[PDB]
């Protein structure tokens, strides 16, 4: 009467057979895609996350990658969709909400097909011919640019104003689009997104943010050292000025008189003087170090009129070698094989209540800093998080410059290619192919559902316009009607839409093949 008279497993271990395992994996995946659906589209809403054990850290976010990383799920099939969402954020940085909704709509349409007595291996084999016919019809519809500067710049402005839409930055979209497109062109083709330092601080409105022409450092200068020096020659170094060079051996002093100790002590103090004099042979007036500088060499730099900046980590030394143009130097033995930096004015600025070192007038300027101002701490965190999605997707368009019309036009495009294929192949796979084309057409439905429009009427108009020739038709969310995509300026990235189909089709394939869930005995937690 029970699950076999004999006992195979231990106490606390559970097993699920075919008819109940499909029930757990299908309600677990739909639950994930229902919480996230509300944050999709230009008019998506926003969530609140409170921690119960992490000292009550209140964070407010919109993207569907930080929400899943925070929600603690115990469902085995819901952990796959949280992992695939993290990989999307770490690959292209945009499209986490769309990859989870699509992979959750494929599973919903695969439960009504099992109820029609269709083997799961039939659905999977029928979906493989649907993804192949969908990625061919998207590549053929891409517009390759980059041969003209006046055209490539207009393509990057449209991408930036499309990503910032669902995010809190959409209020000041005209201002944060120029800060997001100019900071990427400063990299001069290098994909090093770490070079952009986002400094956030309280006070001021969201409209007070700007992109500084030079550089900013949150460090301090030594005592009684010049605050400003015009036409500086910066030397970037990484050398140990702490106490003295310890000279790592197993050595010790074994003198027999206390006067001989005083002579050795005077030998250390003349060791650091020689090191400082070898630095000054370069003819500099701005020494920058990545370690601490003690009280002896601090006065030696201040007697010759040299600015010393101490305790700047790797993040602030690698960046300063790309801005001014110097090199990270050590051993100070050949002044002719080293290259110095350059500036035009260095001063101290007052942003709020803190002082920062300002670099006005630079040679290269391959790295920059962005100053974010806001009312609350949650706005600063969300502005930084949203701005990072604009920089990540603009670093991909420069390497692979081809764009695909978005705003619902791309989803209906691939959905029509599957329909024409499903009307050709005989057998049961014609039923499985229509489900794939049915799941792609609900992405535009959710966008129009959040805005309160008649979704069932707009999809019918789009499907009828995409089967007659109009390949650029899409949703117009500012009015509620149907508008062209090549006129309004709704543009996306080709790599982002390609990674959504391939990721959401693999996760729906791994989950669908499962027919037995075996759970081990959970590790118990010691209460006392």
């Amino acid at each position: 009467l029970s699950l076999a008279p004999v006992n195979i497993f231990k106490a606390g271990a559970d097993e699920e057979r075919a008819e109940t395992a499909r029930l757990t994996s299908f309600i677990g995946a739909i639950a994930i895609g229902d919480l996230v659906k509300s944050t999709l589209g230009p008019k998506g809403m926003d969530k609140i996350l409170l921690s119960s054990g992490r000292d009550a850290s209140l964070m407010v976010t919109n993207d569907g990658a930080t929400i899943l990383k925070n929600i603690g799920v115990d469902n085995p099939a819901a952990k796959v969709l949280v992992d695939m969402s993290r990989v999307q954020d770490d690959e292209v940085g945009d499209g986490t909400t769309s990859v989870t909704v699509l992979a959750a709509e494929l599973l919903r349409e695969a439960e009504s097909l099992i109820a029609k007595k269709i083997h799961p291996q039939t659905i999977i084999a029928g979906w493989r011919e649907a993804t192949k016919a969908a990625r061919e019809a998207l590549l053929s519809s891409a517009v390759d640019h980059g041969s003209d500067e006046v055209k490539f710049r207009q393509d990057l402005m449209n991408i930036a104003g499309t990503t910032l839409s669902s995010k809190l930055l959409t209020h000041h979209k005209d201002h944060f689009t120029k800060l997001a497109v100019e900071a990427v062109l400063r990299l001069k083709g290098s994909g090093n997104l770490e070079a952009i330092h986002i400094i956030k601080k309280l006070g001021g409105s969201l409209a007070d943010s700007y992109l500084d022409e030079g550089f900013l450092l949150d460090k301090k200068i030594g005592v009684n050292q010049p605050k400003r020096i015009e036409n500086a020659k910066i030397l970037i170094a990484n050398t140990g000025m702490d106490t003295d060079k310890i000279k790592i051996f197993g050595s010790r002093v074994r003198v027999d008189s206390t006067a001989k100790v005083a002579e050795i002590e005077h030998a250390e103090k003349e060791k650091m003087k020689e090191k400082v004099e070898r630095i000054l042979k370069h003819g500099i007036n701005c020494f920058i170090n990545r370690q601490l500088i003690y009280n002896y060499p601090e006065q030696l730099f201040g007697a010759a009129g040299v600015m010393a900046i101490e305790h700047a980590d790797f993040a602030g030394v690698e960046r300063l070698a790309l801005v001014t143009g110097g090199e990270i130097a050590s051993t100070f033995d050949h002044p002719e094989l080293v290259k110095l930096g350059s500036c035009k004015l260095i001063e101290e600025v007052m942003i709020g209540e803190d002082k920062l070192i300002h670099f006005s007038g630079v040679a290269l300027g391959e790295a920059c800093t962005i100053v974010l101002r806001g009312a609350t701490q949650q706005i600063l965190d969300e502005a930084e998080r949203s701005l990072h999605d604009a920089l990540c997707v603009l670093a991909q368009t420069v390497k692979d410059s081809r764009t695909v019309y978005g705003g619902g036009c791309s989803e209906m495009l691939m959905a029509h290619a599957v329909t024409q294929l499903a009307n050709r192949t005989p057998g049961k796979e014609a039923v499985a192919m229509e489900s794939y084309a049915k799941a792609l057409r609900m992405l535009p439905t959710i966008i129009a559902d959040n805005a309160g429009y008649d979704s069932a009427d707009l999809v019918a108009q789009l499907r009828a316009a995409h089967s007659e020739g109009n390949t650029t038709a899409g949703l117009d969310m500012r009015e509620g009607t149907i508008g062209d995509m090549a006129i309004l300026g709704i543009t996306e990235s080709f790599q982002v839409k390609r990674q959504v189909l391939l990721s959401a089709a693999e996760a729906a394939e791994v989950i669908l093949r499962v027919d037995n869930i075996i759970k081990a005995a959970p590790r118990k937690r010691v209460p006392d």
Partner: protein, 41 residues
């Protein structure tokens, strides 16, 4: 026209629970304001 049925009451009851929480904090420090406001300890 009578479309756009709203089948979810969670957003309505949450937006109303934010109003009552914020309005309650403003009522707490209303007394200490102006040249004749008292002090809290």
């Amino acid at each position: 026209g009578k479309g756009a049925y709203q089948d979810r009451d969670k957003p309505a009851q949450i937006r109303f629970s934010n109003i009552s929480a914020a309005k309650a904090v403003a009522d707490a420090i209303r007394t200490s304001l102006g040249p004749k406001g008292m002090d809290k300890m």
